Amino acid sequence: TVASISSGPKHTQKVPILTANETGATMPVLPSDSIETRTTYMHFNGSETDVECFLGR
Amino acid sequence: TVASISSGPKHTQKVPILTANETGATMPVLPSDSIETRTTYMHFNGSETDVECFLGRAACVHVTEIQNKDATGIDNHREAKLFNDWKINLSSLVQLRKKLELFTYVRFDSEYTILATASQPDSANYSSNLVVQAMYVPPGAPNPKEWDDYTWQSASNPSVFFKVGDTSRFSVPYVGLASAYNCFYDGYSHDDAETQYGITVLNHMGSMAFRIVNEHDEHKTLVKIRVYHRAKHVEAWIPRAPRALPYTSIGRTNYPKNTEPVIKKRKGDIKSY
Amino acid sequence: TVASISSGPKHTQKVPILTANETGATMPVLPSDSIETRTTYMHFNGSETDVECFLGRAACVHVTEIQNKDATGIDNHREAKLFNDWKINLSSLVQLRKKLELFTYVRFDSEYTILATASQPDSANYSSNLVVQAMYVPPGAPNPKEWDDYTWQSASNPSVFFKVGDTSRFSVPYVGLASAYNCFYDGYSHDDAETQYGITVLNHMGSMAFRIVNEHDEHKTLVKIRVYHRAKHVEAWIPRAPRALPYTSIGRTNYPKNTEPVIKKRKGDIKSY
Amino acid sequence: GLPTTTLPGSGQFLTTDDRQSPSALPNYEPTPRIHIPGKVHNLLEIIQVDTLIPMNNTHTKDEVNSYLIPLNANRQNEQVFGTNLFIGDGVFKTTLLGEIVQYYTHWSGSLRFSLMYTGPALSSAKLILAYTPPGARGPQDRREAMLGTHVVWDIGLQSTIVMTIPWTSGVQFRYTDPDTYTSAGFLSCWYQTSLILPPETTGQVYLLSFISACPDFKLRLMKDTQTISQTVALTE
Amino acid sequence: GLPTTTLPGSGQFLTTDDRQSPSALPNYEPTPRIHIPGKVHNLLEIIQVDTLIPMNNTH
Amino acid sequence: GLPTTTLPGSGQFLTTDDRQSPSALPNYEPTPRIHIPGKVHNLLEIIQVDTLIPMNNTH
Amino acid sequence: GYSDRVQQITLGNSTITTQEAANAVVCYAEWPEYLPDVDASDVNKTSKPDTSVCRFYTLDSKTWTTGSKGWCWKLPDALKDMGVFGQNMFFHSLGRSGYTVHVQCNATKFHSGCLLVVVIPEHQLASHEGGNVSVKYTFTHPGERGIDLSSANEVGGPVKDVLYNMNGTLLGNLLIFPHQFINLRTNNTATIVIPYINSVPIDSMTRHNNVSLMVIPIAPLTVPTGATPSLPITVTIAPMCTEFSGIRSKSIVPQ
Amino acid sequence: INYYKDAASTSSAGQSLSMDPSKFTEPVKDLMLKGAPALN
Amino acid sequence: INYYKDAASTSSAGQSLSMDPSKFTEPVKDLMLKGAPALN
Amino acid sequence: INYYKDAASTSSAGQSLSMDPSKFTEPVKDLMLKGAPALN
Ligand SMILES: O[C@H](COc1ccc(C2CCCCC2)cc1)CN1CCN(c2ccccn2)CC1
Numbered sequence A: 001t002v003a004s005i006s007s008g009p010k011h012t013q014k015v016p017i018l019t020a021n022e023t024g025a026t027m028p029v030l031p032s033d034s035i036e037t038r039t040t041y042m043h044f045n046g047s048e049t050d051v052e053c054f055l056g057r
Numbered sequence B, C: 001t002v003a004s005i006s007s008g009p010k011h012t013q014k015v016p017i018l019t020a021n022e023t024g025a026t027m028p029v030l031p032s033d034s035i036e037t038r039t040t041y042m043h044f045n046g047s048e049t050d051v052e053c054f055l056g057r058a059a060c061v062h063v064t065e066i067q068n069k070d071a072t073g074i075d076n077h078r079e080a081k082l083f084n085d086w087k088i089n090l091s092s093l094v095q096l097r098k099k100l101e102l103f104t105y106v107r108f109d110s111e112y113t114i115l116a117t118a119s120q121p122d123s124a125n126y127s128s129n130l131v132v133q134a135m136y137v138p139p140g141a142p143n144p145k146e147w148d149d150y151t152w153q154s155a156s157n158p159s160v161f162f163k164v165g166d167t168s169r170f171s172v173p174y175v176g177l178a179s180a181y182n183c184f185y186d187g188y189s190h191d192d193a194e195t196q197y198g199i200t201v202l203n204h205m206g207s208m209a210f211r212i213v214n215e216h217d218e219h220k221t222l223v224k225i226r227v228y229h230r231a232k233h234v235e236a237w238i239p240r241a242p243r244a245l246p247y248t249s250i251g252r253t254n255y256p257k258n259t260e261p262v263i264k265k266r267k268g269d270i271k272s273y
Numbered sequence D: 001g002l003p004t005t006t007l008p009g010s011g012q013f014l015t016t017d018d019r020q021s022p023s024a025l026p027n028y029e030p031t032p033r034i035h036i037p038g039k040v041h042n043l044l045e046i047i048q049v050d051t052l053i054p055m056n057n058t059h060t061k062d063e064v065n066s067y068l069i070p071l072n073a074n075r076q077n078e079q080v081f082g083t084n085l086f087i088g089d090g091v092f093k094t095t096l097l098g099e100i101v102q103y104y105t106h107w108s109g110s111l112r113f114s115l116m117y118t119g120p121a122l123s124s125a126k127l128i129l130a131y132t133p134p135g136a137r138g139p140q141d142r143r144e145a146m147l148g149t150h151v152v153w154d155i156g157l158q159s160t161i162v163m164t165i166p167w168t169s170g171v172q173f174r175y176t177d178p179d180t181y182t183s184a185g186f187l188s189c190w191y192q193t194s195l196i197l198p199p200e201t202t203g204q205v206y207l208l209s210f211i212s213a214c215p216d217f218k219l220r221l222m223k224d225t226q227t228i229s230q231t232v233a234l235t236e
Numbered sequence E, F: 001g002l003p004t005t006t007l008p009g010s011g012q013f014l015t016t017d018d019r020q021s022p023s024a025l026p027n028y029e030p031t032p033r034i035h036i037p038g039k040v041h042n043l044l045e046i047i048q049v050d051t052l053i054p055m056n057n058t059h
Numbered sequence G: 001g002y003s004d005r006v007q008q009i010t011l012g013n014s015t016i017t018t019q020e021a022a023n024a025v026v027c028y029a030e031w032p033e034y035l036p037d038v039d040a041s042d043v044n045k046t047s048k049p050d051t052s053v054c055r056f057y058t059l060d061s062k063t064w065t066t067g068s069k070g071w072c073w074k075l076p077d078a079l080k081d082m083g084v085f086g087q088n089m090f091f092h093s094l095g096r097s098g099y100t101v102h103v104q105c106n107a108t109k110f111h112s113g114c115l116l117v118v119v120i121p122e123h124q125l126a127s128h129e130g131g132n133v134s135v136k137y138t139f140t141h142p143g144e145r146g147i148d149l150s151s152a153n154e155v156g157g158p159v160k161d162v163l164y165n166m167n168g169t170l171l172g173n174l175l176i177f178p179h180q181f182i183n184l185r186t187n188n189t190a191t192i193v194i195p196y197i198n199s200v201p202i203d204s205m206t207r208h209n210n211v212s213l214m215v216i217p218i219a220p221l222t223v224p225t226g227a228t229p230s231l232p233i234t235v236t237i238a239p240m241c242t243e244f245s246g247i248r249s250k251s252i253v254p255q
Numbered sequence H, I, J: 001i002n003y004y005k006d007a008a009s010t011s012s013a014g015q016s017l018s019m020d021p022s023k024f025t026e027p028v029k030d031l032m033l034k035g036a037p038a039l040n
């Protein structure tokens, strides 16, 4: 799984960082929408935040 | 496997025993390069020198003590040893410490065994049966303040309850923040002019709190806790020179002043046997 | 299997019962060589005379004793039996010793069982519950000096913790330096004019240290340790004459002076029944 | 309900046993491993790297000088140094080899002893190193020394000489803590001809000496080292 | 009778262990589940919804 | 957790029983065996060698 | 006619030639390489100035005399002020690098003396005070000057006792670390290639030094008769495969 | 191996490995594409 | 048989049986052959 | 079933069922046949 993909300079008409929060959504913006990133992998599953785990001790 | 091959007289232009140590290598010279040998087999694998084996037996890492007594009128439970904590480390007691510091970075799972025995140094009718409670108060979690705080509810924090005289045992995954634990760290936590140096900064793992669950009987009971630690699934990188001088502090390399010569002086000459 | 075959009258030139013992042989003569026999079967295998069976049951090899008491002001823990050691041997108690010395070289794995019971010879309110600590201090390792030395950390040395009244048990591979243990050794450790003779020199295996982990209660408690040893995976070479006279020392063959006749004198003649 | 019987040893804690345990942190995900140069797998890997021996032990406080074996120009027939081979004690004891051997009870195998010469390049020398197998005394003169394992070393362009103490033994293991029956011999070194310094040069020259184990080597039965102890627990 | 040995840790209660237990109510039948909008499975699902920060903390 | 019941005899030490035990020296390698003439396997092997009888016991 | 003896290292816009080498050591048998994605954590693209940072900087020279005890430099500290390497260093949040170290000392065939040149990963120093006294920042960040083991104890500084490696271990065992000797009679330089060694993929270049380079006289310098009794030792070091990441404002560090 | 008959007596459940924040993070009626204008 | 779910809870690891001293004993850049001259 | 890893930890060995007294009862160099004269 990639945690971040590689992304480079941008000069577009397509701006993912401008939104309208009045709508009630949290738009899924990522580091790679606003800086230049390199690939990295997650190495993690989110196992210990499962509700079974959270309420299970 | 052969430990030595058979080899006979030599009169060559090819001399394996002359080398240049300035290069930094240790050339793999064998008995058969300089005497006449006969075949012999190894009969041995080097099993018990594997690092998993070397670091894999339980070592005592900590001895603490708590007492069961009437807390009535005690203004500071922590101070009365009504309960106690351990700013968890593996470099307090030194037998295991010298072993680990043969390496720079080490990564492993731990298996803990906790033995608790009771003492009744002054007149008691009997020996009571106490249950010990040990809690892990990570960095940012509430620390117990009294021996019976809400903290001990430990609703999200792993805790084990066992009886004095018995032993408790479980195992923890490798909980280091980086890829390995640093046995050494030549750095600071930030570029501060007075911040502390060492590993004391890096190895931030919280304390393990112990208490007796029992209320008090008429006499007082001393319970002494011994924590044993066994590394399992060991991985070690970069060997270093063994520790020669005595240790003075958890986490610093410092040795004591006016220490004694560590190399044994000859009783005789260089020429002596 | 037949134990005896059927055999009838004989009038031969072939006499199996006349031999020459000067040769060193024991000729395999049977009932059927000299009387008339009938067939009978063995019905038996000789199972319980196998050397694995003969040396394979636990035998008491050592009884020692340690006490739990206030060490305050004790200048010599070892001497107060605050802790104790055993210069490990298998030739202290003699029931097992005579059995082993039927052979010259012996090789086997050992299974130890350690029973610890407590005694309170003088007025106590109760019986405390003590945990015993036994450590193996090989030749060159630190020996305990006090009952709570760094030694007891035992970070590299196998140690077992069990409760008084209980038993502890584990098994050790064959730890001899040679291919077998010498039951006898007609040699010295070097050609010295005054060095000791025997096996006392060869059989160098270190001591096993015992202590109570508990601090002291108001009364004193005597704990007496019994070590049992069972050979498993036995291999024995070269049978010898059984021991006739009493033993005097661990590791020497010496018998006591003015000992008594070991052969029972007849009450009567050679002719007596 | 299945019928069981418990045996002697139940409830004991043996620091050397290896069993499963419940994890206190169910479901936790450890940090990924990244690559780090230098991984060690066996202590046998590291005791083959050679390290310096403080052979010149004759000082009174630890000094850089006890690593230096001095050599005198123009001496003939004489002896450069001597030592027994109790690798767990004496000169050997603080070396990495000595230091690891001390974690085990028994050792067997060949040792590699080398000498690197540091005198001016325009000097010359011929030394003899001799290994004396157990059973005889430390040699007292080269004649005595030369009848056992030896190497005539000719000091040249090639700066180091590697002598091997081949495993000579009845019993297949020796004790690391010094023991008689189990003793390994002596190592001595003498002038074969003599050190000669070029003009305009003077004084003592020194040899550095190293020790490491051959691939031959075996160590067994782990135990605690006499090389470290303590009187109270340390704190931060 | 099968021979056993008990290890260190026997009888301990670790609040984080996960094992089977006898049911006190043998054979009881729980109420059927009906559908309810909003099921959460991971705390990671909810920390992606944004909420307001009291940035102006100065009161 | 599997349900068990312990029988009479639990915890006893019978010097003649034969069971497994943990090794105190995990991973240790014993010295190789070499050949030695004279191996004995059964006491029945040796009681077939004859030895002298002090028949004249009258001393 | 290639000898182990003559060598040329060209890195960036700078070249070194030695006519009296003794092979070269590559720590742990690994050559410096960039940070692979599979090992990456920070999502930032990194900056690889290449030839402007991966060239040879020659630190100021030392003087070996008969009384010398040895010198110690820390990396990347020693280079904190060299050209654009240094700027990059103070300006990014994180950086990573390997190095080629070339230590130089020539004499004549009448001199004797032997230096140990060793690289110690994570060399945590000891306070000469004992106990749990710390070693202040400035003291472990000497810069190009390095630490002079024959200088006096100072307050808040490390201990400078050579038989103990500045940490409670014996000089004799430093040979377990990648190292090479300079024996006037053999050798005139020492070269060690250092791969990046850390427990994290990239780190801060200012709060943590990841190797100390140490040059220690072991067989004392002995000059020919009526020669001047000293020789200079020069250290030239080149960052290799350097990467910087997390650019911003420019760190301010004590003193 | 379950040793017991009832389902309540079994150990903890096993990870949902379900995970779908959109019911919480994007409950909008007309779908919003990142990059397209929020309000048209 | 593992009785437990997590990997940390398993027993000790099993012998590397890896063993390669050359990273420590021969980290030289140009390969040295035993028997050939050290410095050419 | 061995529960333990090391060989020393296994139970007792099992009967040699070897049994050959001739090394002890007839170690003579030239073979003696029962019934034939001992000394010829
Ligand atoms: O073993 C320790 C595990 O930390 C915990 C975590 C949880 C608990 C709880 C779990 C629930 C039961 C109570 C204890 C105890 C210790 C980690 N340990 C920290 C110290 N560390 C090192 C490494 C290098 C140098 C010094 N120490 C070695 C690794």
Ligand SMILES: O[C@H](COc1ccc(C2CCCCC2)cc1)CN1CCN(c2ccccn2)CC1
Pocket: C088, C089, C090, C091, C106, C110, C134, C135, C136, C158, C159, C160, C170, C172, C175, C181, C182, C183, C203, C205, C208, C229, F024, F025
């Ligand atoms: O059984 C002994 C094993 O030695 C140990 C080793 C370790 C321990 C420790 C292991 C960890 C637990 C504590 C005990 C105890 C004894 C060896 N034993 C030595 C004596 N030996 C012989 C042989 C012939 C004649 C006399 N004795 C028979 C064999």
